[PDB]
Amino acid sequence: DLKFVFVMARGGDFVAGDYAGGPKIINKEAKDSELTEQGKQEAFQLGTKLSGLYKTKLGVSKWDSKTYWPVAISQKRAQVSTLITGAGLEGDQSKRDKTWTDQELKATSFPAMESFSRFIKPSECPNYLKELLAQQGEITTIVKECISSVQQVKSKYPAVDEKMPQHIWLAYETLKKLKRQQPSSSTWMTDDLMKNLRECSAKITWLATTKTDTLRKLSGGLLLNDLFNDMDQITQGKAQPNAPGGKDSKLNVFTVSQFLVISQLAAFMPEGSKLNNKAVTASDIYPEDGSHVDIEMYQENNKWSVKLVYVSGKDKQPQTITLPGCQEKCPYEQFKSALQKYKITDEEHQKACKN
Ligand SMILES: CCCCCC/C=C\CCCCCCCC(=O)O
Ligand SMILES: NCCc1c[nH]c2ccc(O)cc12
């Protein structure tokens, strides 16, 4: 009945570090960060959660290299996270604390993976940045709500450039981990200061992926394109493309940084979409730590449909996305048609990034 599930999950918590493209706050690079002990447990819990949600519905008798496919973006902390989530599926306690080989870490890739990061890579997609800066009117109005807090942050960390919209978002996420992990030293980030920065971050990132057709295509179009490439085979009884386990592989788990959850949510919420039968606000949909998007494919006799379930963070209840004009279980061809507008192929995306 349930035949196949895609999961994309934000990676487990890692030692607070600066983002590439972010301001220098920690003076250590997040790309060098270990998962925290909490982050390893969170990643493992996700796999235990997913097994309980889906193992028996998918007809899987044993989670192993044939039955699930753990993938991740090209960052150690995301790759470690995805493999630990796999350990949770398998119920392999000791692999949670494994020091995964460089080899086991690289073996979490798939062909379209790196293209998913093109739109935020410096110099690689200038048209995406032109189109984000074109929304400066709305950005200024949003930032006007938190500019006092940004000024206090910049007072302590002068590298934060309020003129760079991503610096406000990336400073908030950096400070959020720092407050969690070192609370004694973080008493200056009060509840009101962080909640204020969080609102700015939510509104900026949601604007950056949904305000215009070009922002939606460039940030999320390749996600749709690869998903449909896969579902065109699954819906014919064939294996997910490139899945190591072939037809045996019933679950794909993709561990990412926050920006790809945001982009994936945006790609699944064209105008008129609902989350639990209500319009969404930027603040409510902002994917926190522990967030994941679940893409469930159903088959009733010969009829395939797709259901989209979103968990916005740790301990948050799942909510179901409904596309405009479709049901919770949206028949496959209608679902794909509903999402054609902002889908884009790799060849098209490279041209659209540069033209
Ligand atoms: C979530 C959509 C992006 C919002 C605006 C970003 C603007 C310009 C791109 C530069 C920022 C680099 C992001 C790095 C994020 C990461 O690696 O986790
Ligand atoms: N090949 C499918 C890549 C991909 C795109 N979006 C996804 C969401 C979840 C997932 O497991 C995977 C994906």
Residue numbers in the entry: 2 to 356
Paper text:
Our data revealed that these flea salivary acid phosphatase-like proteins have lost their expected catalytic activity and, instead, have adopted a role as scavengers of biogenic amines and leukotrienes.
The three-dimensional structure model of XcAP-1 complexed with serotonin was determined using X-ray crystallography data at a resolution of 1.75 Å. Notably, both Asp227 and Asp231 form salt bridges with the protonated aliphatic amino group of serotonin, contributing to its stabilization. At the bottom of the pocket, the serotonin hydroxyl group forms hydrogen bonds with both Val8 and Asn253, while the indole nitrogen interacts with the side chain of Gln256. In XcAP-1, the residues Met9, Leu228, and Gln265 show good shape complementary with the serotonin indole group, and the pocket is closed by the Val294 residue, providing support for the serotonin molecule. The carboxyl group of the fatty acid is well defined and is oriented towards the substituted catalytic residues, while the hydrocarbon chain extends into the interior of the pocket. The fatty acid’s binding mode is predominantly shaped by the side chains of hydrophobic residues, including Ala21, Gly22, Phe120, Ile121, Leu130, Leu133, Pro166, Trp170, Leu171, Ile205, Ala209, Phe260 and Ile263.
